[PDB]
Amino acid sequence: MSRSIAQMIDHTLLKPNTTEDQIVKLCEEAKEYSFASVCVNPTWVALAAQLLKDAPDVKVCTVIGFPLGATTPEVKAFETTNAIENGATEVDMVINIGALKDKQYELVGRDIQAVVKAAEGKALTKVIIETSLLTEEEKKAACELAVKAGADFVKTSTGFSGGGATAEDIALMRKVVGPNLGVKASGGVRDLSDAKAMIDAGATRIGASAGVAIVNGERSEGSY
Template sequence: MSSLASMIDHTLLKPESTLEQVLQLCEEAETHQFASVCINPSMVPAAYEALKDTKVKVCTVIGFPLGATLTSVKAFEAEKAIAEGASEIDMVINIGALKSGKEKDVRSDMEAVVQAASDKALVKVIIETVLLTEKEKEKACSLAVQAGADFVKTSTGFAGGGATLEDVKLMKRVVGGQVKVKASGGVKDEQTALAMIEAGADRLGTSSGTAIVSGQTGTSSY
């Protein structure tokens, strides 16, 4: 189970999340040796302070959850989060731009965050699969590879859908070994987690990490 735990981003992104809950998340992540905690940007300093002497990384979200933030704002947000202790960045693409056929804008949006991260943090690109056609999913993944991202990620968990095995397989097929794949949204139990990994996921985003490694079923949609 330790190998599975090392693939989990232990997640708490609800807007009403309290400092106490985030610190509990950090404690659970250290106990189970999860890959990271994934929390909102305002909580990065507290999470970093709680985990700075552990192997657990601090991950935060950028342009979240809509992806419609200005590119310059996304880049600044990423830069600031990294300065405050984040070492992994999960950014939401400009979904509307992608669906409008503005591929250069989508790629430059990704590139700005990748450049802001420099070599200081991993960048995971959230393509929000539930809102995309199959061709749009393929294009988003290709653009993420071109932009120099480290991961493509299925979902925010806030758009009415989450990871599916079919989407993970599609994303893995498109990116091959060039970047990694993160499945998030709806991964609530060990069986689903293992199925996502079998389909090609290298990382799992879930608020049910503790339940998964304990052989139980979580309740959150993320």
């Protein structure tokens, strides 16, 4: 068909005070609209994997070393396999931003490789570079270390910093990784218009919380 934008959306709910009923609603909405995945904190991975056990096209995405990215690589790897043991098949980790700003590139790559190795053959890895804290050169350097580390994806924002995704950065990241890794726009994507703008700039996945209203804008653009 004319591919629904729903298949590119990671239904996301990461608030610190999220309760079980809200995760239940989030997984049911994803089963309904056939979102690309749900994105929940690691404590809800087991519940989401059970709720979506008969929905293979809807992955269970969790976040690693989130949202500050300022823990050790060994912790990020342990959380990754722990999440995978609990039923997660996609992981969005946060780079060590301070190590990147200090140009300690070997540790930034070592940090990403720890998650990649822990996920090898079991989960898709997304690397959150947190564009709002990086200069232009650090945005490209982080994407390059993601490519060398073997990640599957680069991701703009955690949604817990000073900004979200912009079309200029999505173009910027798509230029670095090319066709080899996916590019995900996240943080601030509120409407169908924003999501389409990121897709046009090169995004292959959208992290959002208003995914129900975004897809409802897809069925409502052709309404009579």
